């Protein structure tokens, strides 16, 4: 009853888990030793070691339950987790780290209530470091004069790899006033190609697109803050 | 004029064949709107018409239409309340101590309700204050 | 000068009349910016809304141009708002600052208050006191599993802060899915602090809008 069946990542710092281990992307990578670990500070063990169900929830791949209660591997999954750690944490050092393996892990508890979710953190690029940078793939599309009629515009501006957890959108445009404009689209995260863009769509009306300046969606982010300006010239399409 | 025209397109037309170009609008942002718009349909939108408005008629919902290069004034002064009070404060500190310092200071009664308390030094101290 | 702060209540009853108190506090109310909130919902588009004025345009869409009606409480500079019959995808986050009229972006960061449509009983159970556990044991590396677990409360999109004013390297909002439930297990965490090992303690203090309590463990 804490947390319903929501088939999304870590919402940034301030998630909706109390189980959540980093704000931004997991410090450790594919490639090395990725450790991940849920918390429960309450009276969750029950005769012995508590009762964690670990399984790899990856967006848009079903979950597969492979060790349970912490202590014992399911049947049909290879053994290749350390199943240690007691307590309060649950260690699971995850060595192999394929392309499937890097998923969230939600401990689901079975002791306060079955139906839960634990934290876990989703591995991807970590682009945020000095290493690798996000990239963004500016790319606006034209809206046409004939929607602008009715209210709806088609100014959506695709943000490939850009940083999911901060996403702030600093506009250079010569004066707006907003705390806080940027439409969340952010589609399912994955670990293979990580192609996942924020279409902020600004619509306005045919008025409002003529008193409005070159719409030049610029993305500035922690990951790679670098001006890049598309000067997109309005026109009807 | 009268507040709240339909036939603005006569208007533009009249002042079209004048030798005068100096479209005056300060009366609201909805007239300033629509004159906008009639300068628009004709493209006669800057092409030698000087547009002299003030921030008054340029807020709410003027600007939609108008391009840009339209001159607007900014109302200095007029609807901050940061600085603006601090200003007026000072001026009018100033002002009480320029007229402390000159003649006619004489106290009026209390102006309190139900009672006649016409200042008879009104003008006056008006003069003095000026 | 610069005051964009949304201080509305964020958590109301369904189906109930949301006062929205828009705190500005700026420059001037006296029609000069739109003053409007923005309808961004994960899953649909938004629309073109309406804007506010002297004479209080309380006319955002054409469905509800005449429902609302937006008091013009010039006493604290700011007005309220009279949403009634709201649906799901326009219950969103609400963005109800000061609005430049021309809709170009923002230079800002990620603020604003995100009304839901839970029932403010089902939110309001009490709030867990949990003491907080250092687990010094999980030495992986930067960032590790220690913070708060202070849960049982106002929903997510709330004022959320520290320990008094703690670290706050990496702080970020993202509005998420919300829990129809009420159970809302908020709990921020940072990314270099709160994971080295000793006796440090990192316990969360997240305020609430309409509550203001902050000495929940």
């Known amino acids: 009853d804490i947390q319903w069946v929501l088939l999304l990542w870590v919402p940034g710092s301030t998630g909706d888990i109390v189980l959540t281990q980093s704000p931004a992307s997991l410090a450790v990578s594919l490639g090395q030793r990725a450790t991940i670990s849920c918390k429960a500070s309450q009276s969750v063990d029950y005769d012995g070691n508590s009762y964690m169900n670990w399984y790899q929830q990856k967006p848009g791949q079903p979950p597969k339950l492979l060790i349970y209660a912490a202590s014992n591997l399911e049947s049909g999954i290879p053994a290749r987790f350390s199943g240690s750690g007691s307590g309060t944490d649950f260690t699971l050092n995850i060595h192999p780290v394929e392309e499937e393996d890097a998923a969230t892990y939600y401990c689901q508890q079975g002791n306060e209530d079955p139906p839960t979710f634990g934290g876990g953190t989703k591995l991807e690029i970590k682009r945020a470091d000095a290493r690798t940078v996000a990239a963004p793939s500016v790319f606006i599309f034209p809206p046409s004069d004939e929607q602008l009629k009715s209210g709806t515009a088609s100014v959506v501006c695709l943000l490939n790899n850009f940083y999911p957890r901060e996403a702030k959108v600093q506009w250079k445009v010569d004066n707006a006033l907003q705390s806080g404009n940027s439409q969340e689209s952010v589609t399912e995260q994955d670990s293979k190609d990580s192609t996942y863009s924020l279409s902020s769509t600004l619509t306005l009306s045919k008025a409002d697109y003529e008193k409005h300046k070159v719409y030049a969606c610029e993305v500035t982010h922690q990951g790679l803050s670098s001006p890049v300006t598309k000067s997109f010239n309005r026109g009807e399409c | 004029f009268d507040p709240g025209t339909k036939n603005v397109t006569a208007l533009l037309m009249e002042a079209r064949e004048l030798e005068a170009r100096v479209i005056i609008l300060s009366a609201s942002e909805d007239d300033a709107a629509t004159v906008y718009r009639a300068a628009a349909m004709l493209n006669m939108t800057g092409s030698g018409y000087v547009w002299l408005v003030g921030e008054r008629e340029i807020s709410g919902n003027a600007l939609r239409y108008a391009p840009d290069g339209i001159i607007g004034l900014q109302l200095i002064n007029g609807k901050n309340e940061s600085a603006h009070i601090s200003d007026a404060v000072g001026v009018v500190a100033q002002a009480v101590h320029e007229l402390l310092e000159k003649e006619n200071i004489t106290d009026p009664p209390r102006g309190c309700v139900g009672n006649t308390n016409i200042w008879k030094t009104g003008p006056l101290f008006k003069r003095v204050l000026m | 000068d610069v005051q964009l702060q949304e201080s509305g209540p964020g958590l109301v009853k369904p189906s109930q009349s949301l006062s929205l108190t828009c705190t500005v506090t700026?420059?001037?109310?006296?029609?000069?910016?739109?003053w409007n909130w923005i309808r961004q919902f994960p899953g649909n588009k938004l629309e073109w809304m309406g804007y506010?004025?002297?004479?209080?345009?309380?006319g955002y869409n054409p469905s509800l141009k005449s429902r609302i009606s937006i008091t013009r409480d010039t006493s604290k500079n700011q007005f309220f708002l009279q949403l009634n019959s709201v649906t799901t995808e326009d219950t969103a986050t609400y963005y109800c600052?000061?609005?430049?009229?021309?809709?170009?972006?923002?230079?800002?960061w990620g603020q604003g208050t995100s009304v839901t449509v839970s029932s403010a009983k089902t939110t309001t159970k009490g709030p867990s006191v949990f003491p907080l556990a250092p687990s010094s044991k999980s030495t992986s590396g930067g960032t590790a599993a220690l913070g708060c677990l202070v849960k049982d409360y106002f929903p997510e999109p709330v004022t959320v802060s520290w320990n008094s004013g703690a670290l706050t390297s990496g702080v970020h909002t993202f509005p998420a899915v919300l829990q129809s439930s009420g159970l809302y297990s908020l709990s921020s965490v940072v990314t270099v602090p709160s994971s080295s090992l000793g006796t440090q303690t990192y316990i969360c203090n997240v305020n609430h809008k309409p509550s203001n309590t902050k000495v929940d463990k």
């Open positions: 700026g420059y001037s109310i006296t029609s000069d910016y739109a």
């Open positions: 600052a000061r609005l430049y009229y021309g809709f170009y972006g923002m230079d800002y």
């Open positions: 506010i004025s002297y004479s209080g345009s309380t």
